[PDB]
Structure formats: structure tokens, C-alpha cells
């Protein structure tokens, strides 16, 4: 599973938990889900859709 990239301000509301980034599907992720997708689920929610 690939790693992810982040920048604070540019272009919050996350795609996963919908609480206030994948290089493939381009989906905003918060810190919590950024850790859960890597450490536990081993697949990206945006990559499934």
C-alpha cells in the first residue's frame, strides 16, 4: 500500500469519516483515517469506489 501526502490549508472535510491525500484517486483524508487506512485496513476507501 502506497503512502499519502498532505498540506494543511490548500484546496478538512475528509472523504472517509466526513470529519473536518491519495496520489491516485485524489481524495482528502484526515490524520486519523490516514493512519487507519495504512495501519489496519490496507486499502484506500477512494481506491475502492
Amino acid at each position: 500500500l502506497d503512502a499519502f501526502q498532505e498540506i494543511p490549508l490548500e484546496e478538512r472535510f475528509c472523504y472517509g469519516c466526513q470529519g473536518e491525500v491519495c496520489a491516485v484517486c485524489q481524495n482528502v483524508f484526515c490524520v486519523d483515517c490516514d493512519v487507519f487506512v495504512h495501519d489496519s485496513l490496507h486499502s484506500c476507501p477512494g481506491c475502492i469506489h
Binding site: 472517509g16 484526515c30 483515517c33 489496519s40 486499502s43
Partner: protein
């Protein structure tokens, strides 16, 4: 404290066919039953939390979060009038919705005794392409000790009864639809 995350299979193809077949049971009745069950869950204890996600062909959208019923209604209305259905992608993606639910239970688990539980109501064909994905979201549910329950309305899911067997959940194959709520309130209320 308890957690209830209702995953409703809002596959537009199956529900549209069900309205065309002119059965008394449509998507509106299913959503009303879901809202009743969720209201009961929230009422049982003022600690409880509720989540309702709709599994569409394209995306999985949180219907929630009575004010709750209103927000659910408006959300499903927008989700079913503003849509883009590509012909190739016609199956329902149970795995994606389950993934969203899992990552939601992550933060909610971090907030705290939270005993999490996911209820899935399915109606349509379950895609076989998500074998690599769906299995994943079962094991992620197993390692977090989240239970996965299944009320299947019509078509059988080898995948979802598989997931219920793994997680330690309940698989209910309800026959007649007007009697759904009675079952829903009975065996699936934590």
C-alpha cells in the same frame, strides 16, 4: 455506550425494479423503517451514537449525521435526484461503504466504553470484483472487534454471510417485506 452504524443498500437499480414490480415495499418504506430503528437505538440510552450510510453504485454518502430524520430525508433526496450513473459501473459497492464506516468508528473509538456494531441491509446483487477489497474490510472489522450484521431482503450474499460469520454477526433472510420492521426492531436493536 453502544454504536450502531446502519448501512443501507441504496442500489438504485434494484429499488427501481422493486417499484416497477409494484410490490408494496419501496425504498421509502425501507428508509422509514431504518429511521424508526435508529430512533429506538438513540432513545434506549442517551449515551448512544448513530450513523447511517447509503451504499450507492458510485459513492457512499453519510445520511446521518426528529432533526435526525429530517437530515436523513434531505440527504437521500439529494443523493437520488442528483446522480451520475455510468453504464459500466452498475453494481453496488458494499466494500467501500463498509470501509467508510470502519474509518468513522476509528475516530469515534478514539473519542472515549464504546461497543461498536454495523448493521447492513442488502437487496441487490453483490459485486464479485471487490473480493480483494471486501475481505480486507472484514478483517479490519475483525481486528477492531466490530460486529457485522446482515438483514438481506431478496438476493443472497455469500460475501456478507461470510463477513457475518467472521466478525461474529447475525445473518437474517427476511421473507415478506411488510413484516420487516418487526424483525428490524427485534433482533438488530443492541
Amino acid at each position: 455506550l453502544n454504536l450502531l452504524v446502519i448501512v443501507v443498500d441504496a442500489n438504485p437499480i434494484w429499488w427501481g425494479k422493486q417499484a416497477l414490480k409494484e410490490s408494496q415495499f419501496t425504498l421509502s418504506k425501507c428508509i422509514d423503517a431504518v429511521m424508526v430503528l435508529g430512533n429506538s437505538h438513540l432513545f434506549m440510552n442517551r449515551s448512544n451514537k448513530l450513523a447511517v450510510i447509503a451504499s450507492h453504485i458510485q459513492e457512499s454518502r453519510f445520511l446521518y449525521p426528529t432533526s435526525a430524520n429530517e437530515v436523513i430525508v434531505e440527504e437521500i433526496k439529494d443523493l437520488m435526484t442528483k446522480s451520475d450513473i455510468k453504464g459500466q459501473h452498475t453494481e453496488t459497492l458494499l466494500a467501500g461503504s463498509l470501509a467508510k464506516a470502519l474509518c468513522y468508528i476509528h475516530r469515534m473509538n478514539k473519542e472515549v466504553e464504546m461497543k461498536s456494531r454495523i448493521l447492513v441491509i442488502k437487496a441487490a446483487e453483490d459485486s464479485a470484483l471487490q473480493y480483494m477489497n471486501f475481505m480486507n474490510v472484514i478483517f479490519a472489522a475483525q481486528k477492531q472487534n466490530i460486529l457485522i450484521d446482515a438483514c438481506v431482503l431478496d438476493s443472497d450474499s455469500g460475501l456478507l454471510q461470510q463477513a457475518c460469520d467472521i466478525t461474529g454477526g447475525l445473518y437474517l433472510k427476511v421473507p415478506q417485506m411488510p413484516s420487516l420492521l418487526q424483525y428490524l426492531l427485534w433482533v438488530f436493536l443492541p
